[PDB]
Amino acid sequence: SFSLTTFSPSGKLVQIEYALAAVAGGAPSVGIKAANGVVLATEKKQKSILYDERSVHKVEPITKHIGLVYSGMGPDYRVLVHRARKLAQQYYLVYQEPIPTAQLVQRVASVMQEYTQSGGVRPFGVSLLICGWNEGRPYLFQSDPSGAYFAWKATAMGKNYVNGKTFLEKRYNEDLELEDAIHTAILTLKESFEGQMTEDNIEVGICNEAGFRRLTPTEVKDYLAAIA
Amino acid sequence: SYDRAITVFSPDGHLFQVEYAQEAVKKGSTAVGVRGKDIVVLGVEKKSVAKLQDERTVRKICALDDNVCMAFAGLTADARIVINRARVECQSHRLTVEDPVTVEYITRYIASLKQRYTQSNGRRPFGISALIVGFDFDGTPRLYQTDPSGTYHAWKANAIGRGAKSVREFLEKNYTDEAIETDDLTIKLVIKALLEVVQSGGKNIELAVMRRDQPLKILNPEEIEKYVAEIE
Amino acid sequence: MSRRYDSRTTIFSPEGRLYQVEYAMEAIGHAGTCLGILANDGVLLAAERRNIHKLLDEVFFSEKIYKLNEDMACSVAGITSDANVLTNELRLIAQRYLLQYQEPIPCEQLVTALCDIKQAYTQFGGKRPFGVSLLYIGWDKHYGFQLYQSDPSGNYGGWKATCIGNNSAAAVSMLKQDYKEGEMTLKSALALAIKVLNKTMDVSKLSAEKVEIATLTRENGKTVIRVLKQKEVEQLIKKHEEEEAK
Amino acid sequence: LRVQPEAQAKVDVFREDLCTKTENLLGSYFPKKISELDAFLKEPALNEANLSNLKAPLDIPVPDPGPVNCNEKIVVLLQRLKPEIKDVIEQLNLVTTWLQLQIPRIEDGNNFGVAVQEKVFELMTSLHTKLEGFHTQISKYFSERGDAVTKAAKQPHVGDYRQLVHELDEAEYRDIRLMVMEIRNAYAVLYDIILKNFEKLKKPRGETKGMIY
Amino acid sequence: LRVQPEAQAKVDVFREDLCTKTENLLGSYFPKKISELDAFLKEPALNEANLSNLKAPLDIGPVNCNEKIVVLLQRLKPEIKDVIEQLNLVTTWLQLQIPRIEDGNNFGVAVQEKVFELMTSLHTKLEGFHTQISKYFSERGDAVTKAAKQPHVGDYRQLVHELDEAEYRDIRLMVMEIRNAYAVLYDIILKNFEKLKKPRGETKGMI
């Protein structure tokens, strides 16, 4: 019942320091907010053909208009899934409306802070990247295990995330349609990913006026033709 | 919850915890008080003002009741807890007894908290030592100091903070039946006690006085310079 | 509960100090520069922005500046994690005040209420202390315009002008010189804060994005809190750049 | 400290040279000496089947009731080994300072990226210590042999003086093959180990990092 | 044991004498010796920028050493004898201020033990400086002996030239060492003097 996270002689938290170093080496994940939609393209890589791609999906929706991707530990993420989804449920219980992305990320990031204080528990090993659609304005947020959530037009997360950020710094700018947002998210994803690129290796999903939806492997193959 | 024994014995029986708590008391600012005839005078020295910090929030002279005031030297954070909890219990005693609170009553209501919280499970010993001074029935003054170990004593004149022993040396020698005989002598002797620990400051010194049934009164800095004006 | 895993944060130093508390203020010492000034016609609170990137959004409000209630506001220097809980707790405390007393909370009551919570965690519980130092501004019916400063140890005090974070001692040294007590108003204090911000900040090319300024004043019986728009800050930059060089 | 525009720039040029020497050290010097020390041990001097050919005759007679010289073969084999030791030591000092330039200031946070640099730094000094020992023994092999020879001529009495200087020839020769093998093994092993930890060696942390620590 | 007013007061006065001395040392004797030997290094004899002037060539009995260097070594000797004696007064006083043994309250122990080891190890280095003074006397003397044994190789005369260099180079550095033995340690003692004069003792008497 004693806190496992304490202040270092330099003032920095030692436990959360390794949490941020853990999510830095996770699966490469990128996202872009352009025009009326946000593109989420992650990496699902299977170590053999026996693996069923339809059983486990890395891109999961939080609700109709909100979706979330991740780079980091598997088990700690599904704990975030249940609690964040139950937070959206307890939201809809009280407020009977779709949850805004700013309020959703705020109280979920507060759960990450509870385990930097309460004893006998380790902090989360997952850095969440949240996508949301409210009042016609798209939302792209980035949260790490430290509990501090930011906002980005485009960013990168996972292995070699520094390159993905610099690449989008050069290539990406304003006035990009959702079709260009997908194509640009694929190009920055071609850099971090290594090897042959198929529809099963990448899991892509978007959020627009119609809400957050995941892309089927059929239309993903159409984008693998370097068309849009 | 967090349940463990904090303060534990040593090979010599001394308590390293409590001893380090008294070291933080020694590093506090110098505060002093002296029992007069019908009056008592408290004072403390605060030199830290470049005109920036406000003088309303700095006050270390606190009143537990109309007839009981106090001053503290130590960690300013631990004092705010003790002063508040002492006032809650002091007025809860006026709930149990229509008569006011004798200074010795509340001093047991205070030093006992430093007894419990020192030996309690998971708790921490207090790093403060305060002078509880007030007037008992018939107008007899009383001056009591607490200890982070939980002990308390009675004193005719006492001081706390850095150089507290040096102030007592001037109290021990210069306090006689001639001392604190009238009002003019009580005011001068408390000031003269602080004049040695003066670090070239003529205003920063703060003083307060309580006479009989009158409430605690703070003596303004302008009259401080007038009473310090007569030295030789 | 294996003993070997407990650091026993309640241990006093041989000089009577707390290690976890002293390490907390050091982490605050690396936080960005945040200052505030108490003036006759209003209170002024300004701060810099350490995070600067071309891809940042910041489409909401200020960074380290929060609003406690209608009549009060605060700034932040420290770990942004512990700042979110304190900002929540301060708002909870100030609201729990509205429950019983149903009046705007005095600026003195809200400070001592959180500090009692800070002390309690350093006293017991085994949990680490908080790494955030907070400044407070606002108006009350008794004392009027107020500016306060808080430390993670639970200690606090009133201030006419102060600074926290990086370049704190440098700004305090300038406040001991230029600041005129009971003379300069909110308008004159605005030009003074910009002068102190520019000189104490070694990073050149101060822009409306790189800095943030918020004002709180009482007009016609209503507390008016605002954050100056980037164009309004750019206008102040045009004013200060004539009074710097020219 | 005041800014010197020319002096600080020349220090950067110094760091540029260490970056050039480090790249030439891993990519060029190491594999060239691996293959060179391959043919050096395959050389019939060190591949010699009968070591009596490299035995320099020294005959100190004893009375019953001279032909002293240096050994050209063993000395030249050590004459080639000494600069190979001297060159790699100078190169280890170049990457030692280059590592020091890549080590940030003293900080406890994320100091394990520096600890990885400290492990390789110990590996650089461990090889340096052995290389210092190699050349030190070689200098001692020359001093002790030349002394054992002149002490044999000083005391033409005990026959072990004649046998001692003969065994010193056989000892130094086998010392050549061992030192060259150890040094040659040190090129490829240290090379492969550096490339593993080169991530932390060159970049202990990134370039410019951190988010609200 | 019984109390003897004669022998006991002799110990108390002796401890109070070293207390008055240590105060007279820090207030007067130390800063006087600091500025004295700081000007001793500022002497142009130790400021010589050309070591060829101090090279004494051998006549190759007509054998000598550089008289200027020997005098600098003869001036270096009593100045080191001056620092050793004045520090023994502080060294003894600190050993006479030792409070009764306690397992805790070791801050004052660390204050006394640190400066004690600094002064003790300094006295060892100061005695090592005396060894260097007598060494350079024997180094050039034995180098001339080898030069007189084989007056052929020119490096024999260059050896004693390197010695004259090594002597004067180390003299200026040893003068810098004994200058730090005064001032650097004086600043260290002055910082641990004011409230740390008696870091343990005259403390427990809070009440």
Place this chain on the structure above:
Amino acid sequence: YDRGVNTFSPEGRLFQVEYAIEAIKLGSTAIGIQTSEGVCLAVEKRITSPLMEPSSIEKIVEIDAHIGCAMSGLIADAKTLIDKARVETQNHWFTYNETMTVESVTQAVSNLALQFGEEDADPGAMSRPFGVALLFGGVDEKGPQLFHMDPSGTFVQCDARAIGSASEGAQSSLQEVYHKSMTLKEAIKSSLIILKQVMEEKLNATNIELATVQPGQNFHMFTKEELEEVIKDI
């Protein structure tokens, strides 16, 4: 350190209990005496400076009308037991409507001595052992009785007992002065003789406190008047 308060020694004894008895040597000296005419208690105020008031120092407390008490060791732990011993004494008269035997007084207090622990306890549990030694004198149906307890909680009937820093040489001195039928007033004389030898200061009328209980008189503290008449008999 690297152990709990419940950790046994290699000899099988609690460290916290051992150090508790060792801390009594830093307390105040009090010498009780049991006689056929009553029980005598004496203690020194230990005034280190004239500024203190001797009225605030009470080292002899009254549990019941016929039952007295003495104090030493740690002061903080004693004030908790003195109040708890009083409550249980009145809980006796509240239940059985009679005066508690001093042996049962030592019995109820000895129960809370070793209760200390960490796990499986309540919030009202004590962390550290008592650093206080107590002397219970009094008169009951069996006559004057004088008892003693230590931090371990063992209570033993004693004819004479001394506590505090000077208890080492005082207990050995009690065996010399106590012979057979020696009365209360004679025990008071021998009490001041041993107490004056063991103290470092001078014996004065206001320097020490003296209280006795009798079979025909309730426990009584001698005031400054009577104390001057007692010290005069030396």
Place this chain on the structure above:
Amino acid sequence: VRLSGEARKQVEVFRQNLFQEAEEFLYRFLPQKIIYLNQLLQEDSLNVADLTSLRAPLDIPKCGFLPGNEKVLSLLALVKPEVWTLKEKCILVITWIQHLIPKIEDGNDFGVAIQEKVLERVNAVKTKVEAFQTTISKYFSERGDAVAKASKETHVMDYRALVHERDEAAYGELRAMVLDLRAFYAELYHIISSNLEKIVNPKGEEKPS
């Protein structure tokens, strides 16, 4: 940095050869050299229990020729080559184990720790083998100065017995070296072969990256 394609080829050819070098010494030399020195120590040359006849006494007066000990010098033909051979091959075992050190990690290093603890024991063998190289050459330098001083002194005869004590130490070491070198072959085989699985597999390479 930058590297040529042949630079990695020099490492791969080195890795393959270094692998076979440790494979030969483990599965050929270690088993066979134990019975070697076991029969050598039990051979009549090293099995002589009389050390009085193995001494090399010399007359102490055209003075007579003063040889060394024919036994000690000839019995080195059994010792000396095994001293150089074992040291040369222990280097290749040290080089092989050090070459299998993966990327240095601040955790999960237990497989590397097993390698390090084997490196210390194999180097401890190499250290004692180097001490044998010293004893071989020291006997010729020590006895040479000892017999000459025994030759310079006709007044004191017992230096020959002091010279005899160097003979007992020499032949005592001759049996001790073939005993220790055999123990080395035995200790190396038991330590390497049993811990071989952990040295060849210091890391599981299950990293989720």
Place this chain on the structure above:
Amino acid sequence: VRLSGEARKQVEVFRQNLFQEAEEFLYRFLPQKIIYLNQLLQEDSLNVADLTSLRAPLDIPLPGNEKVLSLLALVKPEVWTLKEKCILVITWIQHLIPKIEDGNDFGVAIQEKVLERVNAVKTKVEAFQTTISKYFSERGDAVAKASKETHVMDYRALVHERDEAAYGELRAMVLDLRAFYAELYHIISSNLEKIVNPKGEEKPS
């Protein structure tokens, strides 16, 4: 304290003048001499490793070595000058030592490790000069002793080991001395913030 209240400004000699004097050597002397040896080590006098070409002619079956004085002339003042600056860096940090206290040892531990590297450099440059003095004593003693060997060509041929080591070490001295300038300049500049300001003095009442 009962100390004399005079000579209060006499601390400004070392705490200011010598303090700023040591500064001038940190940001000027140290970086200026890094590039000096960088070009000096690259000099072809050091780069030639040939045993016979570097050394003086040795006539033995009594000449010395005059060719070593070409390098020693440049090496000796460069090795000694840093040895003095190391002392000035020590004292410069000694004035930055906070008053004796238990805590706040982070900046103290940094200063201890920096002073350890300064003492490590001062010790190594002291061993350089000692070896420099050994060149004259040994070269003279060797030729005097090597003159005894006539029929022995083995010893005389191996005396050239110190003839080669004389020059091979000087190149190692110049290289290491340059690494000392780079080490002292880089470590002090990187930790300059904590070395100058070990204690921020943020403690309120």
Place this chain on the structure above:
Amino acid sequence: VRLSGEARKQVEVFRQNLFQEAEEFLYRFLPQKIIYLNQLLQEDSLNVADLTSLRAPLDIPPKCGFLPGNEKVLSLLALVKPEVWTLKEKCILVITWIQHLIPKIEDGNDFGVAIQEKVLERVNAVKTKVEAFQTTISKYFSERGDAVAKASKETHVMDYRALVHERDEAAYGELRAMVLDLRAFYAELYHIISSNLEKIVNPKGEEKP
């Protein structure tokens, strides 16, 4: 074991006799020797400012004239030597006197043990400095023994033969330093013991109910 009743009582008498015998020294002689050397350091022989006359110039050209020691230093040693030897005797008597106070071996009651060990360690540390003076006094004879010999051995160098005279002044300067340190040891050992007599004499409390 087998405990002889007669032999066990003899040791108890001796542990008591040396216990009271060392008390005579710790009480009487220790403070007496403090002011005894206080008059020794104030001797006008140690107060001489000019050391040029205190050296003993040697006549160095064998028929060379007789070269004794320094009559100034040797005369000062005549007073210093019996005080150094005596304190070395006292120190062991203090060490054994502390060993008499070693309590019965048990886990508890170790607070008096930690105090007497630190006192005995300092007495042994001072005694090490006392026998260090024993070494330096014997060193001055080895210093001047090798110096005067090599000074008279070398007639070619006219300096080193006259430069060994600096060790005469160095022996004088260190002698006045030893007189100060030898007197300090009497003061250092007395104050540390006298102030700690509370816990030194009574380390064990003898409480075992």
